[PDB]
Design a protein around this ligand. Structure first.
Ligand code: HEC
Length: 108
């Protein structure tokens, strides 16, 4: 089904184990392998200031929302072929819902 709000508490733990290596959620957090995710919802892809994206991510020009984030995170490379994000996906719908619930709040 489409995105449905889950547990931000569980989502935070999922973010720590699966995403934190490469991403911060905080404005003015450290630079990492992946782009700062602050403000990502409601922005187009390829727009984080200072970050060096692939042409693939920029050209996709997706306007991020919770539903297309869930599709992306299921399998990033299927959604954006040629992306350099070395992440194979969140296979479980409940994990995507929980993670995205956290991420939407944590990046606001
Ligand atoms: C490093 C090994 C990473 C892990 C683990 C995750 N991400 Fe990532 N992400 C990474 C890179 C190098 C990039 C840039 C890709 C490119 O082709 O330029 C990304 C990109 C994203 C994006 C898109 C951002 C945009 O501005 O369009 C999102 C939304 C994103 N990453 C989220 C994300 C989440 C939620 C993760 C855990 C589930 C995750 N990433 C893991 C590198 C890495």
């Amino acid at each position: 089904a489409e995105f449905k709000a889950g547990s931000a508490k569980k989502g935070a733990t999922l973010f720590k184990t699966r995403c934190l290596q490469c991403h911060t959620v905080e404005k003015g957090g450290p630079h990492k392998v992946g782009p700062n995710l602050h403000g990502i919802f409601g922005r187009h892809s390829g727009q984080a200031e200072g970050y060096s994206y692939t042409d693939a991510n920029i050209k996709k020009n997706v306007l991020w929302d919770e539903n297309n984030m869930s599709e992306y995170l299921t399998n990033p490379k299927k959604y954006i072929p040629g992306t350099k994000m070395a992440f194979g996906g969140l296979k479980k719908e409940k994990d995507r819902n929980d993670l995205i619930t956290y991420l939407k709040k944590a990046t606001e």
